[PDB]
Each structure stands twice: as C-alpha cells, then as structure tokens.
Design a protein around this ligand. Structure first.
Ligand SMILES: [Mg+2]
Ligand SMILES: [Mg+2]
Length: 467
C-alpha cells in the first residue's frame, strides 16, 4: 500500500519527533507526504517539527496545506498561529485562534489561547530617546546590598569576577550599575561603524563564539575552559546572546561588562534575537521586565540597535550572524554604509546579515524561516571572490557537533550553546583563529549543570507548543 507505506513512514516520524530528533522527523514526514500528499495530519505534524527547528516559513506553509485539506483540523490553526506568532505576526495568529473558538470550544483554546493572543495584539498596539528619562546618582544603593558595584563609575576585573560569582549564585546586579553599563556601552557602540575591522598581527589569536541564548552557566564553562577575556585573549560573540535560555540577563550584562572593559578586544555582533520582534516572544523582554523594568528593557532595545552587523578580520575572513545576500554585487563597502540604528527591514542587506542561511545547491531560495534567503555555493564564491576574501564565519543554525564547514569550506558555522534549550543534546563549539594562520581550530564542549529553571520561563505561554 502506497498509502500504508506512507503511514508506516509517518509512525516512524512521530518516533523521531518524541525523542527530539527533529531533522529525521522532518525527513520521514516528507517521505510520507511524497507517498500521500493529501493528508492534513502529515502537514500538521511536519509543521510542528519545522516550528521546533525555527523554520517558521515552512511551518506556515505546511499548516496552510493542512487547513485547506481539512477546515476542521484544529491543530492546523494552532500551528499556523504558532508560526505567525513565531514571527510575531499576532493579528494573523488571532484570526486562527478566532476560527477555533467558533468551532464551539469553551476550552484551553477559548479563554486561554484566543484571549491571551488578543492581549498581545493589544499591548503591541499602544506602540524621544529613553536615555533621557534616566538619572544616575538619583538611583541609590541599599544598606543591605552585598553585591558588585562599579569602582568610581567604571568596570574593573574585580567587578567582572564578582559579577559572575553573583550570577552563579542566582543573584541580581543592582540597577544603577545595570543602567551605568548600558548608557556607556551605547556610547561605545554608536561610535563604531556597521562593519568592524580588526587586525590580528603575526602572533595574535582570537576566539570566535556563536549563539549563546542565555545559557549563562555554559558561558562560564567557556571562560573556565578557554580562560577569561582580555587584550591578550580577545573574543567575538556572533549574535544571539539572549532569548530561549532563562539566564539571558546574566549573559548580556557580562558580555556588556567585558565590552566596556576591553573596547578593542571584545566584540559583539547583532543577531536576529537582538531585536524587539524576537525579544518580546522568546523570553528576554519578560526576563528584563521581571528583574528590572520596562524602561530598562527599552534601554536594552536601544543599545542593541547600535550593535554592529558584521566584522572583517585582516580583509580576509568576514563574520556575521546570518549570512550573505538576496542580491549579487554586495561588497564590504556596502555593509559599512548600512544605517544600522533601528529594527531590521522585512527584506534587505541588513535583514540578510541577521537572518539568511547557506544551502547546498546553487542559487537562491526564499528562506525556510520566512525571512531573508537561502544562498548557494555559487553566491558565496561570487561574493567572497569579489572581495578577495577566503571564507566567512557565521552561526544562527544549531549543529549537533557545535559547528559545520560547508560550501567547500567557504562558509563555516559555529554554535556555542550546548544541550540547546536543555533538549537538543548537541555539543557546542568555539573557534581559535590566528594572525599567521587565518584558519579555524574548532574546540567542542559539552553542557554544564545549571539551576532548576526551564528555558523560556519568562516568555509568553503561547509559544510553548513550539518548543
Ligand atoms: Mg539566530
Ligand atoms: Mg539562533
């Protein structure tokens, strides 16, 4: 049976799915969908696996197919909403939750889902600089606060070593200090150019890390295994400092600490999760609001807008979070000229730097995440050789080994978040480069125990089916 063979595959895809092997779930769903392209559940199941792998575009596309095949398939609306919700398209999500409430539930759909999504549309709807409404010495520190403070308004190593111990014991930095770091780090960032250029002389090294996503205790592990950062042991962190993991405030503040302390040897590049759109959805906004205030968060939003988009070492190896572009003939000079200080456009070189992905085959296709593009080896080569560059480094995608090398070694991916979301079982990796040898050495590391906190504990209840 063609149809029975397909159901055989489907059952196998559910098995992979319930044990977090989403890449194989997707493959054995697509095999089933090939044998039978006309079953809404197959499209619903796969949509969820795409959702859990952050492929919101393909997730949306499959959910649509499921709904069309079966107007009464309720999980279709749930997963299409979850997909639009994942891109923060909450109006379009509402209209699906709406469609389920009038198939007559007084359910978890009715008063929970539809109502809470409507609240988010509404809170969105409400919406000078926020640096203004701030007063430094007006804020004041208590008799009973036994925590880290700035030494005469500046960051020091004693401060940073105290900060991490404080955070290791699940304790909060005092807000005046937090505001002090953000006010200054915005000052440092807004001076820089969209494209940052470092020289790594003859004998110098540099450690390039990928996504960290608020897994603070893995950020320490990195620092405990590869040593603390300095002007002799520089680091680059390639976006996605926050969201998903529930210690994102701990991560971002320590990364902002070292950046003020070593402005020429610690570099932060903007990721797609350094953005209001993603922060409101995947935990960071909630975490900042829970531990500080909405004003602190709006400050965080402003400082991220000044985060540089790419980094070019020695005119040879270029670095971004996402990847390369929707259009040919993009150079390093083009990147330098981007007016970064804002939220990224729905399409463009700014959008691409934060969002795009490599694909094996030549040319371009609309991205599986529903934003930017997938770009082939020919697009990578044409770009790299137009700028006499050797190879790019990027992150953005989770790898089971912690890294991957592709496009015939012209496109490298590095990922620094092990056991991603406490579930993927992946290893993580960081890269050693050097001036004499502009070439990657991949160290891999495993996850380290943390306090009993679910990932996305500060995020809305409505993207929990998409975890
Ligand atoms: Mg990302
Ligand atoms: Mg990412």
């Amino acid at each position: 049976g063609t149809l029975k063979r397909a159901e055989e595959l489907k059952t196998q895809a559910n098995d992979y799915f319930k044990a977090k092997d989403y890449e194989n779930a997707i493959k054995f769903y697509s095999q089933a969908i090939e044998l039978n392209p006309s079953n809404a559940i197959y499209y619903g199941n796969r949509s969820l696996a795409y959702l859990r792998t952050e492929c919101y575009g393909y997730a949306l596309g499959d959910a649509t197919r499921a709904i069309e095949l079966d107007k009464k398939y309720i999980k279709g609306y749930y997963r299409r909403a979850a997909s639009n919700m994942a891109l923060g398209k909450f109006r379009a999500a509402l209209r699906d939750y709406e469609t389920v409430v009038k198939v007559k539930p007084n359910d978890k759909d009715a008063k929970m889902k539809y109502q809470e999504c409507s609240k988010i549309v509404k809170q969105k709807a409400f919406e000078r600089s926020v640096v203004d409404s701030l007063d430094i010495e007006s804020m004041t520190i208590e008799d009973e606060y036994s925590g880290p403070k700035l030494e005469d308004g500046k960051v020091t190593i004693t401060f940073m070593k105290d900060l991490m111990q404080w955070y290791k014991d699940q304790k909060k930095l005092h807000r005046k200090c937090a505001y002090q770091i953000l006010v200054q780090v915005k000052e440092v960032l807004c001076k820089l150019s969209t494209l940052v250029e470092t020289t790594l002389k003859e004998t110098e090294k540099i450690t390039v890390c990928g996504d960290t996503h608020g897994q603070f205790y893995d950020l320490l592990n990195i620092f405990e295994l590869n040593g603390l950062p300095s002007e002799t042991n520089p680091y680059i962190f390639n976006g996605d400092f926050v969201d998903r993991g529930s210690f994102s405030v701990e991560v971002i503040l320590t990364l902002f600490g070292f950046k003020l302390l070593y402005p020429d040897h610690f570099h932060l590049l903007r990721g797609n999760h350094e953005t209001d759109n993603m922060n409101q959805i995947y935990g960071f906004e909630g975490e900042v609001k829970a531990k500080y205030t909405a004003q602190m968060y709006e400050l965080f939003s402003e400082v991220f807008e000044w985060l540089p988009l790419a980094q070019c070492i020695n005119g040879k190896v270029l670095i971004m979070h996402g990847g390369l572009f929707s259009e040919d003939g993009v150079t390093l000079d083009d990147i330098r000229k981007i007016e970064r200080n804002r939220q990224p456009p729905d399409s463009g070189p700014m959008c691409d730097l934060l969002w795009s992905d490599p694909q094996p085959q030549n040319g371009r296709s609309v991205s599986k995440r529903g934003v930017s593009c997938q770009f082939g080896p020919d697009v990578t080569k044409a770009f790299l050789e137009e700028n006499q560059l050797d190879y790019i480094i990027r992150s953005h995608e989770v790898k089971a080994e912690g890294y991957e090398v592709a496009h015939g070694g012209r496109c490298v991916t590095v990922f620094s978040a092990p056991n991603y979301c406490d579930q993927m079982g992946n290893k993580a990796s960081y890269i050693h480069l050097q001036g004499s040898d502009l070439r990657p050495q991949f160290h891999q590391f495993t996850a380290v125990p943390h306090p009993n906190v679910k990932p996305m504990a500060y995020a809305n209840t409505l993207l929990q089916l998409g975890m």
